[PDB]
């Protein structure tokens, strides 16, 4: 069984027991989040746009920063160079139940 839900301006196809990395949620580790807008559940219920009664429950398992990305900007012959680092925050959630 799997469900499709929106979180962090992205969509995620998940089953129970899966750990899913999302954009940071302002929720503590251990705490339960509910994704009540569920686009699809296949055991096939297809939302228009959301499956009536569909909730995915999940435990927040961790917050953290992803791998460092280096931003290099360089304009050849124009005496311009700029570097920046980036680490994107994430929230890992473990899916606990799907229910239409």
């Amino acid at each position: 069984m799997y469900a499709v839900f929106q979180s962090g301006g992205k969509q995620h196809r998940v089953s129970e027991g899966q750990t899913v990395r999302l954009e940071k949620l302002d929720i503590a580790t251990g705490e339960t989040v509910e994704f009540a807008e569920v686009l699809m559940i296949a055991n096939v219920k297809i939302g228009v746009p959301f499956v009536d009664g569909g909730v995915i429950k999940a435990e927040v398992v961790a917050h953290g920063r992803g791998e460092k990305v280096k931003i290099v900007k360089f304009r050849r012959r124009k005496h311009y160079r700029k570097q920046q680092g980036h680490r994107q925050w994430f929230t890992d959630v473990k899916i606990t139940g799907i229910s239409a």
Partner: protein
């Protein structure tokens, strides 16, 4: 207050040469070349964080098109149908369903067909 540059200079050159590991010839060995190689690698990586989003969407669309045409509908009509059905499932998920759950993809096509007809 004379300052010798050796220790700091070494550290800087080593930092660049570490980033140039795996590069061919002078590009992994020689500072002058490795520095250019590392800058260019960074320019490309910047560009390709944008291109990656283009390339994956292009891949998903191609797969949705294949799967849609197996179910007797073009990509362009399929997407129009899902929009008229008010299905907001994005191309990443549709392309994944197209591969991994062909029956659910068939159900999406049937929903899309019903919306157009």
């Amino acid at each position: 207050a004379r300052v010798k540059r050796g220790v700091i200079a070494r550290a800087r050159h080593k930092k660049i040469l570490k980033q140039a590991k795996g590069y061919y010839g002078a590009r992994s060995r020689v500072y002058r070349v490795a520095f250019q190689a590392v800058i260019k690698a960074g320019q490309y990586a910047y560009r390709d964080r944008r291109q990656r989003k283009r390339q994956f969407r292009q891949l998903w669309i191609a797969r949705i098109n294949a799967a849609a045409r197996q179910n007797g509908i073009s990509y362009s009509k399929f997407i129009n149908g899902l929009k008229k059905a008010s299905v907001e499932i994005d191309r990443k998920i549709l392309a994944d369903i197209a591969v991994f759950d062909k029956v659910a993809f068939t159900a999406l096509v049937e929903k899309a067909k019903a919306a157009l007809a």
